[PDB]
């Protein structure tokens, strides 16, 4: 229902640099599972190549930036995309306090192999908290996808 613009396009190319630590425009099989080990799952060689061949345009175990935008905009057109957001909420809000707590958000950042301060966490709240409750809800979370 909602379409992305050149502005939203800059966040994607910018979002691609997290999975593309090489700077060539590829998300290799080993880079995707590195994301899998920080999520709390065991990555297998059968799964790694299986996930890639879904978007992989070349077919060598790497995902490119043109078709990466192809996967998100596809299932985002069924409007039943509410079941997919429940997935982002469980990764952020682990104990389901109904919203996203600062204590759990930190662990997600620290589990990625990085060290951040609480001062930055306040920035996420002003960015997603409408009434400024200090935590992130799913309802606001839904609207956060169409935010520029």
């Amino acid at each position: 229902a909602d379409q992305l613009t050149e502005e939203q396009i800059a966040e994607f190319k910018e979002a691609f640099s997290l999975f593309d630590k090489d700077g060539d425009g590829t998300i290799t099989t080993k880079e995707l599972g590195t994301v899998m080990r920080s999520l709390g799952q065991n990555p297998t060689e059968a799964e790694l190549q299986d996930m890639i061949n879904e978007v992989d345009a070349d077919g060598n175990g790497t995902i490119d930036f043109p078709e990466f935008l192809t996967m998100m905009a596809r299932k985002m057109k069924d409007t039943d995309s509410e079941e997919e957001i429940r997935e982002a909420f469980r990764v952020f809000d682990k104990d389901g306090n109904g919203y996203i707590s600062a204590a759990e958000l930190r662990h997600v950042m620290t589990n990625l192999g990085e060290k951040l301060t609480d001062e930055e966490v306040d920035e996420m709240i002003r960015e997603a908290d409408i009434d400024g409750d200090g935590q992130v809800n799913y309802e606001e979370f839904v609207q956060m996808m169409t935010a520029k």
């Binding site: 994607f12 979002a15 997290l18 995707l32 879904e54 990764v91 952020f92 996808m145």
Partner: peptide
């Protein structure tokens, strides 16, 4: 949250496949 929100949606669609 705006950038790190798009990264989680991609891993959830490739993991449930």
């Amino acid at each position: 949250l705006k950038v790190l929100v798009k990264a989680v949606l991609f891993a959830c669609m490739l993991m449930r496949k």
